[PDB]
Amino acid sequence: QPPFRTFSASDWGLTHLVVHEQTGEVYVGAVNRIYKLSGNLTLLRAHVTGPVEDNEKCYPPPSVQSCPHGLGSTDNVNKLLLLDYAANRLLACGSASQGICQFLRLDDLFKLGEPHHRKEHYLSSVQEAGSMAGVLIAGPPGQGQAKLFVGTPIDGKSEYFPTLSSRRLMANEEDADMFGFVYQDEFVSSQLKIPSDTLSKFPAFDIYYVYSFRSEQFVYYLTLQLDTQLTSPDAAGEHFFTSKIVRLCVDDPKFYSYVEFPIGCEQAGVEYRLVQDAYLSRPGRALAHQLGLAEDEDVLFTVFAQGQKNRVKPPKESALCLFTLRAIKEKIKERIQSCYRGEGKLSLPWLLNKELGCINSPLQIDDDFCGQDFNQPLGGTVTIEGTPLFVDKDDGLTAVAAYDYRGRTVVFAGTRSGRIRKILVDLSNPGGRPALAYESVVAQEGSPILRDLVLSPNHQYLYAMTEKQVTRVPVESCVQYTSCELCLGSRDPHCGWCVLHSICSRRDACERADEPQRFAADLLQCVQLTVQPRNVSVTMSQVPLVLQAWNVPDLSAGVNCSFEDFTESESVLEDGRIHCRSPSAREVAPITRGQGDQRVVKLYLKSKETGKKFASVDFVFYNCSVHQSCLSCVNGSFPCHWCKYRHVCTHNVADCAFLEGRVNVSEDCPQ
Numbered sequence: 001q002p003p004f005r006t007f008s009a010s011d012w013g014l015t016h017l018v019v020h021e022q023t024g025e026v027y028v029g030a031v032n033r034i035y036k037l038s039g040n041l042t043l044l045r046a047h048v049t050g051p052v053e054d055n056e057k058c059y060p061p062p063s064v065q066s067c068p069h070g071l072g073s074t075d076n077v078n079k080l081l082l083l084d085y086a087a088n089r090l091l092a093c094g095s096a097s098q099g100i101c102q103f104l105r106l107d108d109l110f111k112l113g114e115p116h117h118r119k120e121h122y123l124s125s126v127q128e129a130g131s132m133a134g135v136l137i138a139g140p141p142g143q144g145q146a147k148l149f150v151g152t153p154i155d156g157k158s159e160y161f162p163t164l165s166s167r168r169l170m171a172n173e174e175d176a177d178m179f180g181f182v183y184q185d186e187f188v189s190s191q192l193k194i195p196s197d198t199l200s201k202f203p204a205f206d207i208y209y210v211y212s213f214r215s216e217q218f219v220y221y222l223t224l225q226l227d228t229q230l231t232s233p234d235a236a237g238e239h240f241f242t243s244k245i246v247r248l249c250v251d252d253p254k255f256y257s258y259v260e261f262p263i264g265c266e267q268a269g270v271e272y273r274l275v276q277d278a279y280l281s282r283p284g285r286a287l288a289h290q291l292g293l294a295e296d297e298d299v300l301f302t303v304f305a306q307g308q309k310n311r312v313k314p315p316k317e318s319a320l321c322l323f324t325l326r327a328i329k330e331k332i333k334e335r336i337q338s339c340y341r342g343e344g345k346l347s348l349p350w351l352l353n354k355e356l357g358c359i360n361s362p363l364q365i366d367d368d369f370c371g372q373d374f375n376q377p378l379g380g381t382v383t384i385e386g387t388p389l390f391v392d393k394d395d396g397l398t399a400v401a402a403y404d405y406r407g408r409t410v411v412f413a414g415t416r417s418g419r420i421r422k423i424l425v426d427l428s429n430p431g432g433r434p435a436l437a438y439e440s441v442v443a444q445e446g447s448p449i450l451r452d453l454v455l456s457p458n459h460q461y462l463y464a465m466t467e468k469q470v471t472r473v474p475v476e477s478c479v480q481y482t483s484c485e486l487c488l489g490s491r492d493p494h495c496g497w498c499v500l501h502s503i504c505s506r507r508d509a510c511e512r513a514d515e516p517q518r519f520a521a522d523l524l525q526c527v528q529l530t531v532q533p534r535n536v537s538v539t540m541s542q543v544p545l546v547l548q549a550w551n552v553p554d555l556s557a558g559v560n561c562s563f564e565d566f567t568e569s570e571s572v573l574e575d576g577r578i579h580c581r582s583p584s585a586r587e588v589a590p591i592t593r594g595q596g597d598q599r600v601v602k603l604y605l606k607s608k609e610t611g612k613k614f615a616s617v618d619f620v621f622y623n624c625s626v627h628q629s630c631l632s633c634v635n636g637s638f639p640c641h642w643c644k645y646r647h648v649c650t651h652n653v654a655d656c657a658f659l660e661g662r663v664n665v666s667e668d669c670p671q
């Protein structure tokens with residue numbers, strides 16, 4: 001119900017976000033600036049990094065060696081952003097001066113360093129953000145050494161920048177060994193350069209790195225490369241693309257373990273092969289036993305745009321697909337044993353060019369086999385297919401994230417309209433559909449969500465970032481539902497009905513909700529109320545009602561009968577039934593004064609424990625007087641008698657002139 005905790009931006013737009021797992025503080029990378037915010041998006045420190053005097057053509061940058069083509073003030077876009085919790089700092093890699101990286105200390109953003117005089121201190125000169133991705137890997141704790149796996153496009157600058165490397169993280173930020181490959185010799189290094197040939201063959205070619213995540217002893221990347229097949233050498237602009245997973249080992253210094261499989265999915269014969277975002281989540285016991293996975297097995301959610309055409313602006317039509325971490329390690333261990341049998345060949349047209357074949361070997365591959373000097377780098381033959389969960393043909397999907405709540409498996413997916421649909425994944429939905437979009441919160445109308453979309457540590461809020469602002473969006477928003485009938489009808493996995501407090505909340509937000517009937521799990525368990533009798537004539541006073549309440553806790557605390565906001569009779573309880581009194585006709589008079597033929601009024605049950613009304617039931621006051629004809633009287637839904645001689649309609653039949661004026665039934669009416 002309250003408004004969204006918000007943090008707008010200066011003149012500069014945002015690019016990346018990440019949350020400190022322990023302090024819950026929110027570090028936000030952006031153009032020229034790197035803001036650090038607090039749990040509620042309150043600004044803490046703001047570190048400026050631009051604009052700077054630079055040209056993209058200056059290799060090395062002007063801060064090391066002079067440069068010819070001329071300088072000019074240009075914006076320094078933060079392309080990547082990671083936390084080194086072990087070293088209590090933050091790595092913000094910019095787009096300025098061939099893409100050096102800064103080391104902002106965590107608790108004040110003190111520029112600890114920006115090493116900028118070596119060749120491998122320049123990661124890439126690309127200007128887009130969101131095309132860079134990577135992970136940190138702390139070594140033994142006392143040592144202080146770490147590693148940093150970075151994939152980036154290189155814009156055909158194959159001599160300067162590797163497209164994917166494994167550089168080292170020194171404890172002393174000024175050190176010149178920063179960003180140096182963790183294994184270097186004349187033959188192979190922890191590097192992976194694009195062949196000077198393929199860029200000569202195919203002019204504009206690059207690997208863009210969307211997501212990246214650590215899993216088991218590996219690191220996986222979801223890349224999106226230009227298809228070397230579906231595109232002619234002519235760089236007209238008709239180039240199609242192909243999304244591919246990539247995986248390395250953390251303990252593979254020579255980079256033998258490389259592997260690259262295409263990915264995508266379909267639903268109703270629609271192709272989706274342009275990866276957009278991806279999130280690694282543990283699926284929670286509900287979706288777990290549904291998929292046969294152990295409690296330690298993970299899942300990868302993905303977002304694909306339709307087709308393979310146009311990378312810089314994919315079509316709106318998008319799908320949220322699922323890959324189980326099992327099924328990916330399988331298609332690998334099946335294709336890299338397929339090599340160690342001598343069948344087929346390594347198939348990487350961009351990295352290898354000349355069709356080298358697979359070599360035989362009497363070795364049995366594990367799940368944890370990290371390559372050898374043969375049968376690598378290994379290609380991908382069949383595109384790994386994903387499981388479609390949700391399609392959107394109107395407002396494109398742009399970002400993804402997920403977690404679990406009390407078994408149920410929740411997926412948050414950002415849209416180009418700026419909304420964040422809350423998706424529940426279950427295979428046992430009787431409709432045959434696997435996912436239900438149970439809500440569509442709007443974080444900022446008219447701005448696509450950016451793919452960074454992480455939760456607070458307590459999983460309470462999800463920070464949904466656009467170009468213009470961050471938005472602390474509440475995961476649970478159960479209070480918004482007003483009655484049990486639609487609190488549980490929303491199918492929100494967090495939401496149940498706290499019956500005795502008349503509020504929609506989480507199973508732990510309802511006081512004493514473990515006791516029976518205090519909480520409502522299934523819809524067919526909403527509070528139900530019945531009254532005997534439902535109607536009384538305004539002529540009557542204080543007629544005894546008997547109410548029967550169903551699906552309610554131990555009401556022995558005490559309960560009142562409240563007729564909307566008029567009478568408030570205190571009640572008594574016997575067996576399973578609630579006795580109380582109708583209003584006295586002195587009280588009934590202003591209730592029905594005006595409402596004419598009848599008035600329905602809500603007969604509530606106010607509990608002594610809470611003090612709030614929790615159960616409602618319709619109660620009717622009728623007024624036989626207002627009926628004008630003999631038939632207005634009789635055929636009325638309620639017992640009214642027509643006095644044919646006085647020409648009036650009443651309840652207590654003593655009002656008639658004589659008895660023979662008693663007209664009970666419609667056929668005994670005169671005309």
Ligand SMILES: *[C@@H]1O[C@H](CO)[C@@H](O[C@@H]2O[C@H](CO)[C@@H](O)[C@H](O)[C@H]2NC(C)=O)[C@H](O)[C@H]1NC(C)=O
Binds near residue numbers: 532534620
């Ligand atoms: C008005 O209330 C009365 C009583 O609560 C309802 O009349 C009952 O109708 C059933 C069905 O024929 C009978 O078995 C009961 O004996 C009736 N009771 C009495 C006291 O008449 C009546 O249906 C209600 N009508 C409306 C429109 O609410």
Ligand SMILES: *[C@@H]1O[C@H](CO)[C@@H](O[C@@H]2O[C@H](CO)[C@@H](O)[C@H](O)[C@H]2NC(C)=O)[C@H](O)[C@H]1NC(C)=O
Binds near residue numbers: 538588626
């Ligand atoms: C039941 O209905 C009758 C008729 O509508 C109400 O009596 C009328 O009250 C108005 C306003 O005071 C008078 O101007 C009319 O002359 C009255 N008509 C009759 C026939 O008495 C009566 O007040 C209603 N009873 C309740 C409890 O609301």
Ligand SMILES: *[C@@H]1O[C@H](CO)[C@@H](O)[C@H](O)[C@H]1NC(C)=O
Binds near residue numbers: 038039040042
């Ligand atoms: C926001 O949170 C900070 C700490 O995280 C707190 O000091 C501040 O009072 C809060 N302000 C608002 C408006 O919520």
Ligand SMILES: *[C@@H]1O[C@H](CO)[C@@H](O)[C@H](O)[C@H]1NC(C)=O
Binds near residue numbers: 560570611
């Ligand atoms: C129940 O009704 C009586 C009658 O006035 C009132 O005094 C009492 O406060 C009511 N109980 C609650 C919980 O409102």
